[PDB]
């Protein structure tokens, strides 16, 4: 099998060759041979992206491509999804810029994502909320690009239990004075859903309002990866920074390798129709890999990707923020329990 | 049922009765789906069709 590994950014030039032999040594399964090819992308320009990928897809006839990065550029993810539509070659991302949440899945595409759905992250929050017993709270969201409150209505469905929860909805904030509307807040527990790029002016408007100290906590949960901000911040990571991102290259190539290994043992064939970009000017032929990933077991954990193509039960991580501009991780999260550090004038006993 | 005959004669509508699939009057229940739009019992069949 001619598996391909690619990177974006000159920082991966040295490690492109280093991870080569590691992939061959780390991945060892019967009936499968690994042939990685080390590549480095020239920045993130559009026309090279199609040129470099397709020419390698034609000149070298790559069989599956896995891309990873550490930047904050999610722009090229749909384009990578876009070209893969006409070749039927599955593409899996790991983390970084072009690995954030994407929806929906384009027709005739198999762009698997190693990300965490927004609803799944929100569900984890309420498990944290009951542990600390913060019943009264309000979430805040703004009018931001690529945002829809529909994914945030899972809270309305939930909260029906014997403990009861309180809400006040949310108030939208325009990009462009903000102190005249944000005053409608009653609880310190606030949840944020907005663009990270425009969050900095939003933070400044809230910081000048006195909503910075430990009296008022802030939540930063969503596709707003960051690894002037207030104290007491929490975020979801899904092991994006930890879990040996230098080793995940062997992990990502492994799962796709099991896909062809299982397909061959289930249907012995070599369907390399996507050998060339322009082999046939049609989009009616498909090798049908979407019917896979029902049962993916590795690392004593399940990696069964759904129709949406995200990890159903990933290792979500809760992190904190020291007041002295210091990033830190507090507690831990696992399958269905919340073993966490720190479990336990008007404040009197 | 003795009331039902009186109505049918007065207005000309015919009928055929049939009891409830499961013997519950009807409420709203949801554990793994939408909280509303889940009517069981008599409240279910009347709404369903």
């Amino acid at each position: 099998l001619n598996v391909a590994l690619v990177f974006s950014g000159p920082a991966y030039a040295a490690e492109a060759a280093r991870l080569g032999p590691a992939v061959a040594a780390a991945v060892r399964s019967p009936g499968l041979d690994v042939r990685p090819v080390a590549l480095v992308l020239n920045g993130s320009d559009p026309r090279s992206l199609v040129l470099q990928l397709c020419d390698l897809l034609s000149g070298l006839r790559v069989h599956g491509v896995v891309f990873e990065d550490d930047s904050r550029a999610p722009a090229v993810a749909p384009i990578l999804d876009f070209l893969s539509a006409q070749t039927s070659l599955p593409i899996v991302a790991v983390h970084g810029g072009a690995a954030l949440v994407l929806t929906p899945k384009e027709k005739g595409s198999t762009f698997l994502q190693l990300g965490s759905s927004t609803e799944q992250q929100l569900q984890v929050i309420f498990e944290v909320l009951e542990e600390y017993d913060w019943t009264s709270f309000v979430a805040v969201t703004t009018r931001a690009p690529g945002h829809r409150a529909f994914l945030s209505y899972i809270e309305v469905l939930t909260d029906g239990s014997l403990v009861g929860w309180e809400h006040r909805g949310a108030l939208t904030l325009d990009p462009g004075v903000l102190s005249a509307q944000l005053r409608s807040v009653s609880a310190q527990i606030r949840l944020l859903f907005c663009a990270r790029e425009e969050a900095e002016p939003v933070f400044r408007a809230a910081e000048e309002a006195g909503l910075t100290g430990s009296g008022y906590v802030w939540f930063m949960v969503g596709p707003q990866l960051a690894g002037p901000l207030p104290a007491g911040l929490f975020a979801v990571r899904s092991a994006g920074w930890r879990d040996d991102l230098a080793r995940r290259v062997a992990a990502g190539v492994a799962v796709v390798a099991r896909g062809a290994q299982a397909l061959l043992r289930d249907y012995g064939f070599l369907p390399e129709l996507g050998h060339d970009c322009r082999a046939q000017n049609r989009t009616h032929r498909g090798e049908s890999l979407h019917r896979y990933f029902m049962n993916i077991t590795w690392d004593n954990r399940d990696y069964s990707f759904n129709e949406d193509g995200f990890l159903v039960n990933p290792s979500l991580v809760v992190i904190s923020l020291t007041r002295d501009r210091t990033w830190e991780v507090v507690g831990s999260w696992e399958q269905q329990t919340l073993r966490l550090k720190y479990p336990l004038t008007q404040h009197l006993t | 049922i003795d009331l039902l005959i009186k109505l049918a004669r007065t207005m000309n509508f015919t009928y055929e009765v049939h009891l409830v699939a499961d013997g519950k009057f009807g409420t709203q229940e949801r554990v793994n789906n939408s909280n509303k739009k889940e009517w069981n019992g008599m409240m279910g069949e009347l709404l369903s069709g």
Binding site: G43, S48, I79, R148 | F25, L46
Partner: protein, 387 residues
Amino acid sequence: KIVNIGAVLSTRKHEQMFREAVNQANKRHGSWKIQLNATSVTHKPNAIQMALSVCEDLISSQVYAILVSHPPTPNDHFTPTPVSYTAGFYRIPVLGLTTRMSIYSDKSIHLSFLRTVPPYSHQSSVWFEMMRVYSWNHIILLVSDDHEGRAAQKRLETLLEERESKAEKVLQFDPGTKNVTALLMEAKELEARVIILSASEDDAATVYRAAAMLNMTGSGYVWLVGEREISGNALRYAPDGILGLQLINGKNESAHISDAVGVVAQAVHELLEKENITDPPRGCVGNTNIWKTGPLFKRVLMSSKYADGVTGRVEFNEDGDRKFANYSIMNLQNRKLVQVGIYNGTHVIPNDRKIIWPGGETEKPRGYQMSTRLKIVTIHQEPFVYV
């Protein structure tokens, strides 16, 4: 000083009128700084350069905006997709021409988009007034299960909840229709006599033939039909009393070309601001930057009138809503299609010549039937209902 624009189309004759129009629309602006150039390019059906020619030439020319039109090729949501990703990559506004697809209606995938022609999704409102003005009620709809199908329902119920006039049944079928007769059987005993079909053109032929031997296209059967399911093979094998919509500005863009050039010419007057007027990035060779004055002038783009051109009702709304458009309701008589009237924000029914219905009855077939047969449920409760 000089501002470049994107003018990709599918006809070499159309690009000629651009040069004279820009050499005419310059005098409309007064030519304070108007030295604009056409800078048009021709696309190719092959899928190799469609990911290349987007920035091979257009972005190298330091364009401010691009105009894309649907080619006469028999395709949908295919040609305006490459420009959607490329323009959004640089956060460049992109506007479509004759872009009549419903998937170009979410901002999540296409951050910036516009079109001067309404898509098939919004005609659902036109159905409501027609059944409202004809005093129709107890209606059912047959919709496929796809992107249009989901977009087909969702608009429809929002306009019915104020009066709570819920449709009797919303049964739907899969797009891969193949000898469907059981589904049509269910929609027979419900006493509707009015049906709204909004599938694609190919799907109409199957259901039309499937309903042919079911004898359910006789009298007491009023049908509401959308634009996409009139032409093509849907023209054949159709019932007589088919009522179908249209759009007068459709299948032409010469008048749209004048409007498209003029509206972007109005942008220059409000480009004179103390805020930064930084030009878009130049060259596709490599860039990590975007030009931030895009959304700054976006808000004024929908805040314009631009009288005349096309009926003089050019307003624009989010994601190329194209608020105002004439539809010109038409009808089938025998075999030769006819016209019954036109439509705007509120319907007009001139009744040009006449209207016909299946079976040739010269009277509106009231779609309803009293159900003189109905079931009763009961539970076993001792003093009231023994068993």
